[PDB]
Automatic annotation (TrEMBL), chain A:
It comes from Homo sapiens. It comes from the Eukaryota. It is found in: Cell projection, Filopodium; Cell projection, Lamellipodium; Cytoplasm, Cytoskeleton. Residues 1-53 form the T-SNARE coiled-coil homology domain. Belongs to the ABI family. This is Abl interactor 2. The chain holds residues 54 to 106 of 458 of the full protein.
Amino acid sequence: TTQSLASVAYLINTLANNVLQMLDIQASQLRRMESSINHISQTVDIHKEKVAR
Amino acid sequence: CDLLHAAPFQNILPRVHVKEGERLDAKMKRLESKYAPLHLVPLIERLGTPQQIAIAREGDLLTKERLCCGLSMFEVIL
Amino acid sequence: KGIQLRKVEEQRENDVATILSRRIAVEY
Amino acid sequence: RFVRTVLPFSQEFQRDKQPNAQPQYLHGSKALNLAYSSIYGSYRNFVGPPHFQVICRLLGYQGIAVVMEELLKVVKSL
């Protein structure tokens, strides 16, 4: 029973850590891609204003 | 009116009142260095990214050039 | 042409939201 | 200021039929609708600087340019 409890706890801990890291990586990707999309929007706005002028 | 609001970020100070025994040039230099944190293009150039710098330059160029300063339309219509 | 298209090309159920919307719209 | 004529020459506009909806898609409620209608009813019987401010602010350079070109075409036709 002691071995079983220790092993189950260890396995659950490792899974939780892996899921946490995965989520954090995805959040970082989305932050970076948001920055790039904002830059593209700014460029498109600049182009449209130039055409209007 | 649109231009009157871009002045702080573009370094267009007003004429300052120099009282007795003061230098206009040094006074204006002190005012300029007071407001130097508001100037946007050099700040982004120093701290920004190449894409940010290109976008900032383009935006500033668009902002400062308006028809009110040296263009007219009615004569062309006539 | 745009106004003609908009007039002719107007808009065209077992969804609860649709039923409630119709009820309230008739109620107005 | 502009003002409407007496004995108007054109009555062929045939403007789109007014849409209707619940009060929360307009200013927000029956009382708010009435209040804002009363507020803006004062702008209805003339055209002046405020209307032109709104027109410029909403049309931008694009709309201003296209409108002027079309007015030139109208005057050429006439």
